[PDB]
Amino acid sequence: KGKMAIVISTLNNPWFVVLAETAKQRAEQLGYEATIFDSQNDTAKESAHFDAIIAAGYDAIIFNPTDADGSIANVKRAKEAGIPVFCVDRGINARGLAVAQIYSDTSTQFPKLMARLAVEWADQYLRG
Amino acid sequence: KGKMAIVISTLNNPWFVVLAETAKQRAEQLGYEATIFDSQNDTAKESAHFDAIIAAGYDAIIFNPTDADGSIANVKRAKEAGIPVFCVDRGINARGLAVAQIYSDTSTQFPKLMARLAVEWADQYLR
């Protein structure tokens, strides 16, 4: 129980709509309240969103960043407020391979959690 | 059911031993057969592991890479063979902070599964 903030870089691109909407739905299925914050590819809007999320005292943040400067600053602010952040994105490697990524500074000491998540992801993929 | 390959960069460090053991246990709990391949910090052995995994027809790969550049080529070969890869690792970011990473060649077009996993990570962290 608690509330999770879903911060998405945009909602005019389908990949991000699916990401934001599915994350909200899964949080609600697990017993959380969840709200989507749309940064609209704007640094100031993303920063304003973190202002409200920190003020509201959300329990966790699912964060799709708009860049690699103001966004890491916003993550730092959430950490100082004691709010864990789990970042989600997709990118293209130097050789062209596209990869979808989840990362977080919270769980580096928890190999059991990371192993279970990776296997559960593979399981959901294979069974569908 | 199915069969997953667990490719670990080394079995000479506790974090990686626990990672590999837990991945094998979780795969079995979820109804899969699982096999561990120890790369022993050797890109040649990692590549040879992917050689045998592709030939054996594994259904999924849980991948802890030895290197950043050379190991991405193994993710390509698996994708070329139609085997989905789910990578788990830890790195040091540009600000010098340790970061835990889970990533895949899947969910780059329809990220429903990755979205759910990110929320489950947060939930398990909170509980």
Author numbering:
A (entry chain C): 1 to 128
B (entry chain A): 1 to 127
Lines from the paper:
Periplasmic binding proteins (PBPs) are a class of proteins that participate in the cellular transport of various ligands. The structurally symmetric bilobal architecture of their fold has long been thought to originate from a duplication and fusion event of an individual lobe. Here, the crystal structures of two permuted halves of a modern ribose-binding protein (RBP) from Thermotoga maritima are reported.
RBP-CPN was designed to consist only of the βA–Eα1–4 elements, which are directly linked to α9. In the concentration range 0.5–5 mg ml−1, the determined molecular weight (MW) of RBP-CPN is approximately 27.5 kDa. This corresponds to a dimeric conformation, as it is about double the expected monomeric MW of 14.9 kDa. The crystal structure of RBP-CPN was solved in the monoclinic space group P21 at 1.79 Å resolution. The asymmetric unit is composed of four chains, of which two pairs form a dimer via a segment swap. Unlike the interface of the two lobes in native PBPs, the dimer is located on the edge of the two central β-sheets. In contrast to the rest of the central β-sheet, the two βE strands form an antiparallel stretch of the extended β-sheet. The novel antiparallel stretch of the dimer-swapped β-sheets has not been observed before in proteins with the type I PBP-like fold, and the existence of this swap highlights the flexibility of this structural element.
